[PDB]
Swiss-Prot record, chain A:
Cellular-component GO terms for this entry: cytoplasmic side of plasma membrane
UniProt repeat feature TPR, residue ranges: 3-36, 41-74, 76-108, 114-147, 148-181, 183-216
Name of the protein in its database record: Lipopolysaccharide assembly protein B
Full-protein interval shown: 67 to 389 of 389
Gene it is expressed from: lapB
Biological process, per Gene Ontology: lipopolysaccharide metabolic process; regulation of lipid biosynthetic process
Length: 323, 338
């Protein structure tokens, strides 16, 4: 009746962005004596959502904390608390709430739990545990065994410990977890294979990677192998063939290097070097990654999209301006 | 209906019945519930207790309601009631200006824009000229060239610096077969907008052909290259050099401009010469692969970009689809525009 109208009117002001008005309406309702207990819970819930929209997370937390012990509100209350603790980077608290949601039991929240443990592990990778970091990552793996991020971070910790064999095992898990993130592991894997004395196998790994269209990284990397091994002629032939098959400005830029280093010298090179330099500056200015959810582009890999707040949606950009 | 009345009731106890109706109508408009917004604001207008100032606010809100609904003529009837009120005049005129453009009522758009200019909105001079161009475009459909030209001249009087007016005058002069006059008009773009010179090159090429003044044409391209207007003039001038001074002399010019203003298009042109001479080997391999890739990159890259909002396109728009600004979309520079 009147109570639902009050609740709704408050909601309308919230979605309009007039959160102060929403707060006033819902708080006055929450504090009214005419309300039933159930109606009051509804008021507390909406007031909680008002505080969320306002960025008043301590206040929001107080509201939702009052609903976790209510069957009709428990699910939403934990869900909102989960959002709060992420927004405030209270990862341990986010885990605990996500745990309750999982034991209630929300399925997909295992994904976020893994990321939360990763966030915690980062705090111990800094200050260099490193045992504490690995412990957290293992808990992360337990939560989501299909998490590419966990695999990558374990690889980095293993490499820090000089455990290159174990690093390869973790890093190559990415192949079956998220193909689009394999390119993020190539630099680390290259170092690992060198430490393991398996440079030959690495060259084959890359050969198969290019065949699976891993992109410019795996191509340029294998080109440097062809060069040091079979000379600059064999490398230029390779890049030439690949450039036709997978046109990219990065491979383009490399092929110009081969020509520029072989053909000299004079006004022909002068203008050519100017162009190749232009390509280089352009490649350097372009974004490397892009959120597949909201199209937020970036320069470095974000696991948590600063825009849409989603997890593991930002992948390397493909195409001519990508890899 | 009953819900709205409930909403109005609880708002009234806090802010008064007038502000309650205004606010709630506004709230529903912003939600896309414009039918609801109109009925709320209409009900407010039925009140006998409205002060004159409050009635103006209600009129303003209904105008905005009708605009949101696309009931433009009803919106106009509202805003026209506000253009003599000091606190509402500028905003009302601007709303009307937006309406008339949305409805392609160019002459009414001109009339309100001209009043805004008088009231200090100098930026509307640019738009007035465009509106006259839109009107000119109608009398060219429709080979009514004399009226089209009359309209373009009114456009020039509003904005003597309008490049679009110069280009369209060029079109009309070319339609009349008066090619010298077309040249005089089109060449004003050199001073009116450096970045739109490239848009005149094809028309000027045609004019100079009809005039048989092939020497004055190369002279203009030199002016355009000197002003750095893009790769189009460089490529056109390159063809003139090749036919006049041979392929070698052209490759040297292009290499010069490529060292000076590097672009993919000019680079592609430079590659054509090498490929046109090179024989089988690593040349026909790497050079061909490179050339064809540049060709695809050029063939795919958009040519234009709005300098205001960043919207890109493959053809020139005078009116930006994204931000609705005029004269903001220009050719993209760098590789390979410059
Ligand atoms: Zn995103
Ligand atoms: Zn725009």
């Amino acid at each position: 009746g009147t109570v639902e109208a009050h609740l709704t009117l408050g909601n309308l002001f919230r979605s309009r962005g007039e959160v102060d008005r929403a707060i006033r309406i819902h708080q006055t309702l929450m504090e009214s004596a005419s309300l039933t207990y159930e109606q009051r819970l509804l008021a507390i819930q909406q007031l909680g959502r008002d505080y969320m929209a306002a960025g008043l997370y301590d206040r929001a937390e107080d509201m939702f904390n009052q609903l976790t012990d209510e069957t009709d509100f428990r699910i939403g209350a934990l869900q909102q608390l989960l959002q709060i603790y992420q927004a405030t980077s209270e990862w341990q608290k986010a885990i605990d709430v996500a745990e309750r949601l999982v034991k209630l039991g929300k399925d997909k929240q295992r994904v976020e739990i893994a990321h939360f443990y990763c966030e915690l592990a980062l705090q111990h990778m800094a200050s260099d545990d490193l045992d504490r970091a690995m412990t957290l990552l293992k808990k992360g793996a337990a939560a989501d065994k299909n998490s590419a991020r966990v695999s990558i971070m374990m690889g980095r910790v293993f490499m820090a410990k000089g455990e290159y064999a174990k690093a390869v095992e973790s890093l190559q898990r990415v192949i079956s977890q998220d193909r689009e993130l394999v390119s993020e592991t190539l630099e680390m894997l290259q170092t690992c294979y060198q430490q393991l004395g398996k440079t030959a196998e690495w060259a084959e790994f890359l050969q198969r990677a290019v065949e699976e269209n891993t992109g410019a990284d795996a191509e340029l990397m294998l080109a440097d192998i062809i060069e040091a091994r079979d000379g600059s002629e064999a490398a230029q032939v390779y890049i030439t063939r690949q450039l036709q098959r997978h046109p990219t400005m990065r491979v383009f830029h490399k092929l110009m290097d081969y020509h520029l280093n072989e053909a000299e010298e004079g006004r022909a090179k002068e203008s050519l070097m100017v162009l190749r330099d232009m390509v280089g500056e352009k490649v350097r200015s372009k974004p490397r990654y892009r959120c597949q959810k909201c199209g937020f582009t970036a320069y470095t890999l974000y696991w948590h999209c600063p825009s849409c707040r989603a997890w593991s949606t930002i992948k390397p950009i493909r195409g001519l301006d990508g890899l």
